[PDB]
Design a protein around this ligand. Sequence first.
Ligand code: NI
Lengths: 124, 124
Amino acid sequence: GSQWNQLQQLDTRYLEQLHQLYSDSFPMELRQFLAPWIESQDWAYAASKESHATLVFHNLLGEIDQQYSRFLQESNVLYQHNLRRIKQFLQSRYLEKPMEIARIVARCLWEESRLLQTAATAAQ
Amino acid sequence: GSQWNQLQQLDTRYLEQLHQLYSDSFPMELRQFLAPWIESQDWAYAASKESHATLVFHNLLGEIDQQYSRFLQESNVLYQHNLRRIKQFLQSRYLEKPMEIARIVARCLWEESRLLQTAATAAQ
Ligand code: NI
């Protein structure tokens, strides 16, 4: 989950591009809260076949539920309200199209790398 | 402490209502990142005079840019992302009618005090 760490140290003139990579399907809250879990899997691979996307999506929902219990401890009402919304949004839209949500995540991670490659080679 | 914290430390039964209260009217992100400032404002008055509402509004935005300023150097991209969502939300929906948000936020706080009382009276 170091990729999210790098992105947090992005140069001030790249953040707006970073803020735009996320969306209601893949909120930035999700990208951070489960960054470890997210970076553990090959998303391009999970998006290649329906079988892989179906399982990944099933577990994403599990990780979101596991985090819901986490912020429930912290009394992080805010983040309980967010994950609650996020989970409901993901279910109604991707429970019959797990490949679609997989593509989105895959695309975002590719974009984060592509963005980092710009800032990285921007040291000349 | 703030009235927001007192609400966070509420029974799981009271939270459901706390969440239903911020489903539409205004983002709980705002209610939380600016709880101190939000609570230190006469919204009932700001709701009756348009010019005052515009000025309280201008101030709310100012407070946002202040935090956004800090979070920018602390490299807390997720917090910046929340603030950014608040501005776009306020900019499009209340810049041309600040008195509206003035009423909404006024109401919400009125509804929060109710939760604090029902919860307090439940201490018997
Ligand atoms: Ni000004």
